[PDB]
């Protein structure tokens, strides 16, 4: 029942970039995450019960550059 | 082994899109070669010993829409 909030600074330079990241993150099994992406700010907010390493790994496996992440 | 030539029409709208595709494909070396990505024509052209479905799924992990693929 603990929700973790992670925020990632991901290099997304078009709505194709942000849309791709959304597609992969919203398709994650099990369905235990809410995903909010701001193209303008280059931010991916993930609210989830999954660990930080796992979510980070899922984003890196898209090929997108992840400049930083953190737990809020 | 049989080296096949695959070409994919991938919806890549910026260099962030194509760079990501390139990064996931270059991870399959040395089982893929001649990675040729055209942002302009939205084409990804590779030589590989891997099955088509494997390469297709690997490209799809970027989150990009793959409109079509062919064997040349
Ligand atoms: Cu893009």
B7, containing H or E segment: strand B4-10
What residues of chain A lie within 8 A of the CB of B44, using their CB?
none
Q: What's B30's DSSP letter?
A: T
**What's the CA-to-centroid distance between A19 and ligand 1, angstroms?**
9
CB contact under 8 A, B20 and A64: yes
Give all strands of the β-sheet with A66-71 in edge-to-edge order: A33-38, A43-48, A4-10, A66-71
Q: What's A49's DSSP letter?
A: S
Q: φ, ψ for residue B16 (rounded to 5)?
A: -65, -35
Burial code (b: 16+ CB inside 10 Å, e: under 16) for A1-29 equals eeeeebbbebebbeebbbbbbbbbbeebe
Q: Provide the β-strand partners of residue A48.
A: A4, A33
Helix axes B15-26, A15-26, angle to 10 degrees: 50
| Separation between Cα atoms, residue B62 and residue B65, nearest integer Å | 9
The answer to whether A50 and A3 have CB atoms below 8 angstroms apart is no
Question: How many folded domains does chain A comprise?
Answer: 1
**What's the CA-to-centroid distance between B30 and ligand 1, angstroms?**
26
CATH label of the domain that carries residue A63: 3.30.70.100
Write out the residue range of the structural domain in which residue A11 sits. 1-72
| Separation between Cα atoms, residue A1 and residue A63, nearest integer Å | 31
Is B17 known to sit in a ligand binding site? yes
Q: How close, in Å, is residue A21 to chain B by CA atoms?
A: 6
The answer to whether B18 and B12 have CB atoms below 8 angstroms apart is yes
């Amino acid at each position: 029942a603990e929700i973790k909030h992670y925020q990632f600074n991901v290099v997304m330079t078009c709505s194709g970039c942000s849309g791709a990241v959304n597609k992969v993150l919203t398709k994650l099994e099990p369905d235990v995450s809410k995903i909010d992406i701001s193209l303008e700010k280059q931010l991916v907010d993930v609210y989830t019960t999954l660990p930080y390493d796992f979510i980070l790994e899922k984003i890196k496996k898209t090929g997108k550059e992840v400049r930083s992440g953190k737990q809020l």
